[PDB]
C-alpha cells in the first residue's frame, strides 16, 4: 500500500528541503535547495510552492503535509523529465560524469569517481559513456 519504507524514503526527501532539521520547510529552505540544483525560482514562485502544500496555512510545510502531497503524486513523465533536466544542465541531452557529480554533491551524496562510472555503466545502454533520456528513464523505471 503506502509502506513504512516508502514513508521513510519520503522523509529523506523532506530532510533534503528541511536543511536545519527543525521539522518544517520554509520558503528560504526551498529556495536554497532549488538554487543548489541550478534552478532559479522567484519569491512568488517559492511562496506558491509552499502555499500548495501547506494545508494548515501556518506558512510552512511539516512532514504530514509533505507526505500528503508526495503520496498523492506517487499515484509521471513530466516529473522524471524535470529530474533529467536537473542533471543535464547544459541541455545537450546526455548526462555526463561531471553533471552527475554536480547533482550528487548538491544532494549531500558522496560517491567516488569509480562509483560515478559504475552508475553510468549500469545505465549506459548505447555505450557512449553518458546517460541519455531513454537510459535515465529505464534506470528509474
Amino acid at each position: 500500500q503506502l509502506t513504512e519504507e516508502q514513508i521513510a524514503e519520503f522523509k529523506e526527501a523532506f530532510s533534503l528541503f528541511d536543511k536545519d532539521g527543525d521539522g518544517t520547510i520554509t520558503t528560504k529552505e526551498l529556495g536554497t535547495v532549488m538554487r543548489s540544483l541550478g534552478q532559479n525560482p522567484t519569491e512568488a514562485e517559492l511562496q506558491d510552492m509552499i502555499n500548495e502544500v501547506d494545508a494548515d496555512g501556518n506558512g510552512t510545510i511539516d512532514f504530514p503535509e509533505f507526505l500528503t502531497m508526495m503520496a498523492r503524486k506517487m499515484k509521471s513523465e513530466e516529473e522524471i523529465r524535470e529530474a533529467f533536466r536537473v542533471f543535464d544542465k547544459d541541455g545537450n541531452g546526455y548526462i555526463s560524469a561531471a553533471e552527475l557529480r554536480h547533482v550528487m554533491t548538491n544532494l549531500g551524496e558522496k560517491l567516488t569517481d569509480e562509483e560515478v562510472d559504475e552508475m553510468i555503466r549500469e545505465a549506459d545502454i548505447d555505450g557512449d559513456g553518458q546517460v541519455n533520456y531513454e537510459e535515465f528513464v529505464q534506470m528509474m523505471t
Binding site: 524514503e9 519520503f10 529523506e12 526527501a13 533534503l16 528541503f17 535547495v33 532549488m34 540544483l37 534552478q39 506558491d48 510552492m49 500548495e52 502544500v53 509533505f66 502531497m69 508526495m70 503524486k73 513530466e78 516529473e79 522524471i80 524535470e82 529530474a83 536537473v86 542533471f87 547533482v103 550528487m104 544532494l107 551524496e109 560517491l111 562509483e115 559504475e118 552508475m119 549500469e122 535515465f136 534506470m139 528509474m140
Partner: peptide
C-alpha cells in the same frame, strides 16, 4: 499541480542515487 512536480522531481533525483547504492550493496549492479 506541476507546482508540486518540482518537489517530486527532487525525490526522483534522490531515488536515482538510492536505487544504485542498494544494488551495489546487495551485489546486483
Amino acid at each position: 499541480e506541476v507546482t508540486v512536480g518540482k518537489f517530486y522531481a527532487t525525490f526522483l533525483i534522490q531515488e536515482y542515487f538510492r536505487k544504485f547504492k542498494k544494488r551495489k550493496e546487495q551485489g546486483l549492479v
